[PDB]
Amino acid sequence: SHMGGVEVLEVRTGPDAITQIEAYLNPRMGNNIPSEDLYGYSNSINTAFSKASDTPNKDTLPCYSVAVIKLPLLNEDMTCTILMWEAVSVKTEVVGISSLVNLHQGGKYIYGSSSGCVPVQGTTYHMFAVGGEPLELQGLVASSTATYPDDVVAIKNMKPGNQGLDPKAKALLDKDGKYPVEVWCPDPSKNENTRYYGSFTGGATTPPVMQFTNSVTTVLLDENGVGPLCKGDKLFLSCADIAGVHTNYSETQVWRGLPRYFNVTLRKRIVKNP
Amino acid sequence: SHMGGVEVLEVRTGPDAITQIEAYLNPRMGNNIPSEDLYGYSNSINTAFSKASDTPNKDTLPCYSVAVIKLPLLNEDMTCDTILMWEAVSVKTEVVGISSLVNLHQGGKYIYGSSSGCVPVQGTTYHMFAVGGEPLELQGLVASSTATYPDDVVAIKNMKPGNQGLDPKAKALLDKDGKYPVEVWCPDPSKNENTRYYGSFTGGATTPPVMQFTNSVTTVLLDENGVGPLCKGDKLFLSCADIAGVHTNYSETQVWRGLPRYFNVTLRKRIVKNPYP
Amino acid sequence: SHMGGVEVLEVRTGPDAITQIEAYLNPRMGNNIPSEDLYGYSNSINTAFSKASDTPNKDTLPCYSVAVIKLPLLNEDMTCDTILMWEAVSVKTEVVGISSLVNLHQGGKYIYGSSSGCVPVQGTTYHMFAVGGEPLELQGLVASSTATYPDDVVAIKNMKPGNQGLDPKAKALLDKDGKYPVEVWCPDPSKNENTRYYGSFTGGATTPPVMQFTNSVTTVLLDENGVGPLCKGDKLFLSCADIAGVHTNYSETQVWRGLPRYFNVTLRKRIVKNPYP
Amino acid sequence: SHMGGVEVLEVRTGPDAITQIEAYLNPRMGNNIPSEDLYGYSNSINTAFSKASDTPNKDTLPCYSVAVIKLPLLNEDMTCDTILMWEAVSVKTEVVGISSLVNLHQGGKYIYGSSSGCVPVQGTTYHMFAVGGEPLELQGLVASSTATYPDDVVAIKNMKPGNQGLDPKAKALLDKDGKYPVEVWCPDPSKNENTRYYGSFTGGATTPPVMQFTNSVTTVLLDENGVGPLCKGDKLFLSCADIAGVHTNYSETQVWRGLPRYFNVTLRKRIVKNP
Amino acid sequence: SHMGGVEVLEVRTGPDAITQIEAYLNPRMGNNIPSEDLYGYSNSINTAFSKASDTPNKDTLPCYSVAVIKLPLLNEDMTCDTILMWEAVSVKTEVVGISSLVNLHQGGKYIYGSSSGCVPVQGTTYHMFAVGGEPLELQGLVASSTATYPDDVVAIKNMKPGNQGLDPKAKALLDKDGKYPVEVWCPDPSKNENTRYYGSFTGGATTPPVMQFTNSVTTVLLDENGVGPLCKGDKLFLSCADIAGVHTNYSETQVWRGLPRYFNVTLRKRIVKNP
Ligand SMILES: CC(=O)N[C@H]1[C@H]([C@H](O)[C@H](O)CO)O[C@@](O[C@@H]2[C@@H](O)[C@H](O)O[C@H](CO)[C@@H]2O)(C(=O)O)C[C@@H]1O
Ligand SMILES: CC(=O)N[C@H]1[C@H]([C@H](O)[C@H](O)CO)O[C@@](O[C@@H]2[C@@H](O)[C@H](O)O[C@H](CO)[C@@H]2O)(C(=O)O)C[C@@H]1O
Ligand SMILES: CC(=O)N[C@H]1[C@H]([C@H](O)[C@H](O)CO)O[C@@](O[C@@H]2[C@@H](O)[C@H](O)O[C@H](CO)[C@@H]2O)(C(=O)O)C[C@@H]1O
Ligand SMILES: CC(=O)N[C@H]1[C@H]([C@H](O)[C@H](O)CO)O[C@@](O[C@@H]2[C@@H](O)[C@H](O)O[C@H](CO)[C@@H]2O)(C(=O)O)C[C@@H]1O
Ligand SMILES: CC(=O)N[C@H]1[C@H]([C@H](O)[C@H](O)CO)O[C@@](O[C@@H]2[C@@H](O)[C@H](O)O[C@H](CO)[C@@H]2O)(C(=O)O)C[C@@H]1O
Ligand SMILES: [Ca+2]
Ligand SMILES: [Ca+2]
Ligand SMILES: [Ca+2]
Ligand SMILES: [Ca+2]
Ligand SMILES: [Ca+2]
Ligand SMILES: [Cl-]
Ligand SMILES: [Cl-]
Ligand SMILES: [Cl-]
Ligand SMILES: [Cl-]
Ligand SMILES: [Cl-]
């Protein structure tokens, strides 16, 4: 016999330097208040009369979600180096995928009136971001002559140049359910302190495809080995998860969105004070 | 010449600390009793008259499958500072009966006209499995909060339009086979620390199903800290749903089609600081 | 200058302990004799009148292919404490004739009108192969328990609605070429410890087929313990099914189209504790 | 207690030997000037009357984008045994404005009837980019040699049926922004030793487009010999085309839709034997 | 300061033991001569009257391309214990002219009505290439044994219904450019020990084509014993077929469309025991 090691499993409370946060963000498809009958969907998509006359109704435009998570305060005085929270990894999941596995919800029939109803399908757009400040946005639209509703943030002084990349069309994703997906995208010329990931599939009637698991972690460190650094001890979580459109019996259509869960691991770092 | 080693093959028993279990779970599409004519399928999908009047008929809603496997007893009682627990380390899993879909003579809607083969199972698919040391924790979320769910399934309590998004009060455990509808419940990503789950969804009205099968693939169940599910009360929970698509009848009524899933799980005995008070 | 090595290429005869075998298996879609006009295809798919009246015609049901390859004799008898056995370590396999589908002049249904090319083979596809040291073990599972299978195929005995899911009594061995229907039998994942199998299915009414071909890919057959299939009685079992889709005739009758599969298996001699009583 | 290291985060200015450039290139689908109503789209696609009579209207042909970026001057003396050159070692690149396609209210053909959303941009897609130390070298190859190309694009000289395959005389340099049609010119794989290019095509009449976007991906530009593009005359060439699909109007006329592309290229100073 | 190394970039000629060859192969869809109006396409596909009466017209059948490249002469004496042979170790290969498909004005069938663009090339695709030290070995297998093949292509001898599966007598060598039909012949996996081949097929009536292009990818040609194709008689065999789909005319007649393929093969001299 000899003295040797054996590994016992127990609850381990992680180092003081490491923290995890969890959050969920509900979708902002247009009906953005939980009391609303069509919460989690847009209102019926109203189409343009013409190029010149294109005025989407209130609540018909899906917008990005954003949540600001206040982390534990690290610095008593900001005058010294300072400590900052560095986001190192994230686990994220689209919640409610299985809700689409439903052929009895009222709408257009797959075949005739004896069949199931057409499920959510068409254009999809799934993106998330984790950063130490608001996601920086670039404006670009399909048509500069659309008139955007009062309750969304649109491009200022829109002109045909906004159908391409105009460097004046910039914004911060600093309000939940206010920045339309069809107007704003991540600005790749900025966002040095944010990591973002997105996938788009278009088409009129395309089948949606989504996976879900609790086994996958995305590392947030950049090419220099540094994760997002949380300015003022605030963590920004942003996303949009448009699953497709639901078609009603009358052939009116509404966007369907799903919520997203985030689990972010952060660590305390010593940072030279700007 | 010299003395040297040669490797002889033989049956090896493996150590007492490791065990393997195998199980299969039959699908729960609505007709959940093997004596039923449409066992392995739902009843005909009945669609809503309206947003307000949406009452799925009994046995038209696919539900999750779950089995609880009783593992070998490890402890005399729960009084010691440490106990032994089974740790699930890996799983091999297979959807069974995929080839049954390779059938164009089953009665139904014709591909072309009445001289052609019949349309096979297609449309929305949903395949998921989980292996854990306790029930899979579920989150409720529905397409429509005004649906009236049948008494024989577990629905969200006191549904409101908020349940079309994530309401933290809509939570459940997958603790009954063939009772929790797929369209109401999904894995809760805010919990499930002691379960591993994996899922794939493809929608669309008539989409072709795609499935693979092999006995060569093993999934490791260890988490980011190197620890597998730990089996509380020496029970292993296997959960799944495998909706292959819908079958369309000649009259255009449609039924969900599900397939069984096989599991082979490897577990090892571990010393664990006693969690039980 | 100095003495040094240079690598010269030459024909090398491998060690006596290693052998390779090559074989091809022609498809068994229904017309299984090379003299038949529709060899490599099924007969026209006849569809069910009803759930209760569903009687596939003779030769309309694709079946698995199987070949048993007799390997070199290794033992004088089975009396010693150890014996020699062939261990299958790797396989190269290819579906042959893929390019034959690149044909829009074969008579059939038109893509557009009567001036256009004809619709090529498309729809449901099913590709699988197995390499083992004994027959592939099969599980039965059908779309409909009330189908009446023809006398010339091996069907599930005393079929009941439970056979639309997994019934553990519905088991068979793939021990006859062109006799076990693909739509009735699939690999049994609860057995097959001495076989490796691999399969892919894509369904749908008219889905485009996708196939690749190369001589650059080798699949390793060693299991999780580093052991390949061990060939009982010095026999190697090769199994497959390769359904490319259906061909549609102008009258809209449809026939399954299959393709042959080539195998190149590498085996090595091993000393094995004698399993034979 | 002991002396030891701790890793402090700070703003680090990269070594003098390394530089990064950022640029964006707007699409050149035919309406190539930001004052134009249909900027970012082609004009309506006019189809051939016949094989012999096929005359695309001006600005109906999507063309490649190119930008030449002037890098810091490295050599005041070009007569030494060696010179310095900028070597492009990696690139991050993104298609911008993908989310603009997530729009079912823009006027056009209806998905179902007049109560539904309108059909989004779909059909043929073509996405490519290149990073090089000199212009991208092009090979000409067309669907039909009897097409008559307009005078505002560069096309194949003395076109003949052989140009429906590879004729080695049909060669060009991508040296004008918005003038070389995608349907006439492709990268020449027999040249381009000093460029890296990457492209993806999916055809079909009405195919759904698929596009990803992230700031997490870097492509290494070093070749098989470990050498990146070397920038002749301290000029960096960025080339691309990003056709997202076509938009269909209610009248069923169709226009190509393109999107801009962003580039972030890292370069390092290298000693090079003087040519 | 000290003596130290710095890596200077320069033009290097590889060792005398290594050579690179570049080639392109134009497609052989039926119109195989660059003077033909429809060069790069087949003639209109004529469909069978029946099972028994199926006679494809001349030049309606896409065929494989092959080029035999003469390499530098290695042995003036062929009677020693060893000879030198070229060993192919890697290949870079690209389909050329993919962008030519990004064309909706070419005359044909309309996507929607007569105001819209025309349907692009789509349907069945077949892409393969091979690099070897001798002709690619072929296996014959057809959709229908009662087809009558024309006298300008090489087909199966004494065709019988068994040729709808694998009959071991139906074997050939790919030794003539543009004469072996794709629909009759495939690589023989039971031979081809001295060739590497790679192929991809996607069928369907109207399927969208998918193709990528880059100059960044190298395929290693070494087999499982670390040996590449050895070039018998100092000849390198390049084979391919690249069927992009079919073009549909307004009358609904259809023609196959093929594209050229580029090859860049690296070879090294090896000492080989004299056979
Ligand atoms: C996303 C969703 O739940 N859509 C509903 C839809 C909406 O509630 C409605 O369009 C918003 O005003 O309503 C659907 O059911 C309708 C009935 O509620 C109504 O009584 O009659 C309608 C007849 O055209 C229709 O049946 C719908 O529009 O199809 C059901 C759908 O799920
Ligand atoms: C999933 C399945 O087996 N579906 C059957 C279907 C069901 O048995 C039935 O719809 C509900 O129990 O029955 C099908 O055959 C029918 C005949 O059994 C009946 O006599 O007449 C019907 C006429 O519309 C029909 O032919 C069906 O509904 O198509 C066959 C199908 O496979
Ligand atoms: C898979 C195949 O070869 N199919 C053939 C088909 C078969 O020979 C037949 O269905 C077996 O009974 O025959 C096709 O051609 C037919 C002619 O042979 C017949 O003279 O007239 C038929 C009229 O509908 C038809 O044209 C077919 O059924 O389309 C040709 C097909 O490739
Ligand atoms: C790509 C794009 O923005 N297309 C517009 C289109 C263009 O403005 C037009 O083709 C360029 O000359 O115009 C569409 O709207 C049209 C109205 O502006 C016009 O008053 O009437 C037309 C009736 O057929 C049509 O409604 C269009 O052609 O559909 C809108 C489209 O987004
Ligand atoms: C692949 C190709 O270029 N196809 C052409 C086609 C060919 O020139 C023809 O099939 C060769 O025999 O011709 C198309 O244009 C035609 C006119 O040239 C002719 O004057 O009238 C035809 C009326 O049906 C037709 O418009 C064609 O057949 O559509 C154009 C096509 O691109
Ligand atoms: Ca910047
Ligand atoms: Ca939690
Ligand atoms: Ca077992
Ligand atoms: Ca060259
Ligand atoms: Ca051989
Ligand atoms: Cl703005
Ligand atoms: Cl609840
Ligand atoms: Cl049985
Ligand atoms: Cl030219
Ligand atoms: Cl022959």
Author numbering:
A (entry chain D): 25 to 104, 106 to 299
B (entry chain E), C (entry chain A): 25 to 301
D (entry chain C), E (entry chain B): 25 to 299
Share the article's original sentences.
Attachment of the LPyV major capsid protein VP1 to receptors on host cells is clearly critical for the restricted tropism of the virus. LPyV VP1 forms a ring-shaped homopentamer in which the five monomers are arranged around a central five-fold axis and connected by extensive interaction surfaces. Sialic acid is a crucial component of the LPyV receptor as removal or modification of cellular sialic acids abolished or modulated LPyV cell binding and infection, but the identity of the sialylated LPyV receptor and its role in tropism are not known. Glycan array and structural analyses show that LPyV VP1 specifically recognizes linear trisaccharides terminating in α2,3-linked sialic acid.
Each LPyV VP1 pentamer contains five oligosaccharide binding sites, which are located at the top of the pentamer, corresponding to the outer surface of the virion. Only some of these binding sites were occupied with ligand, whereas access to the remaining binding sites was blocked by crystal contacts. Both compounds bound in essentially the same manner to each binding site. The terminal Neu5Ac residue, which is best defined by electron density and has low temperature factors (B-factors), inserts deeply into a cleft and engages the protein with multiple contacts. In contrast to most viral sialic acid-binding sites, the LPyV site is not a shallow depression on the protein surface, but a deep cleft that contacts both faces of the Neu5Ac ring, mostly via van der Waals interactions. Consequently, 80% of the accessible surface area of Neu5Ac (317 Å2 of a total of 399 Å2) is buried upon binding. Whereas Neu5Ac in the context of 3SL was readily bound, the analogous α2,6-linked oligosaccharide 6SL was not recognized in both glycan array and crystal soaking experiments. Due to the α2,6-linkage, the overall shape of the trisaccharide is somewhat kinked and differs from the linear orientation found in α2,3-linked compounds. An α2,6-linkage would likely lead to loss of the hydrogen bonds involving Gal and clashes with the BC2cw- or HI-loops of LPyV VP1. The trisaccharide 3SL corresponds to the glycan portion of the ganglioside GM3, a possible receptor candidate. However, the Glc residue in GM3 would most likely be buried in the head group layer of the membrane, and modelling suggests that membrane-bound GM3 would clash with LPyV residue F73 when the Neu5Ac is inserted into the binding pocket.
